[PDB]
């Protein structure tokens, strides 16, 4: 799992 910030928006992606 990686914590991502896209133009301020947060999400977690897990591979």
């Amino acid at each position: 799992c990686q914590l991502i910030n896209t133009n301020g928006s947060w999400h977690i992606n897990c591979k």
Partner: antibody
Amino acid sequence: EVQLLESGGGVVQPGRSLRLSCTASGFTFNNYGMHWVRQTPGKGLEWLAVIWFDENNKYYADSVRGRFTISRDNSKNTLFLQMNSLKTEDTAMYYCARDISLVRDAFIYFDFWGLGTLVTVSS
Amino acid sequence: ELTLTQSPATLSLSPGERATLSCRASQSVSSYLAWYQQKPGQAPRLLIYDASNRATGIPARFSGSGSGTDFTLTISSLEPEDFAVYYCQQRSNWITFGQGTRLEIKR
């Protein structure tokens, strides 16, 4: 009992460095995101940095990006904030804080905070 | 980018009364909102997250509601330990906090 204890604060002059430690106990440290948050009487609470499960996965506020560095040593259950090129307006109480870290439900919320360590930047 | 504005700045009440605290966001944050309590010389404490989800160990007299831009923390019946400073916090876009509502003793 979850516990977070910050140390390293003190008096330093503008332009100097300081490094904060945050010792964690009572939970599995490496399973949680961790943050630094500061507070001043003048402008309240300000989030500074986050480090997630992977120790190279970090984000910072604009006002400290590139001057401060968040890191964690999971074998020592310790969180750090390296504060370079300090300015008088970095004077604050610095809080260690744990992220609720529920990937399925809620995250980027601070479910436990430390006691805080005081940083005074002044000529 | 998103400012949280809290009102009133100071709320003056007595033990047993209902307390209603407001937080307004400058743009919609959906439900990504949390409330914190802080007493002098102590750290904040998490009360509510995701606007209405009561954190573990928080008494039932604390409740949160709202979505979009308008939120409220309700303390149904105040106890003396509830007199303190309260902050809302947003995580829809980066992370920001309101400036706090101070809960003080009416006399």
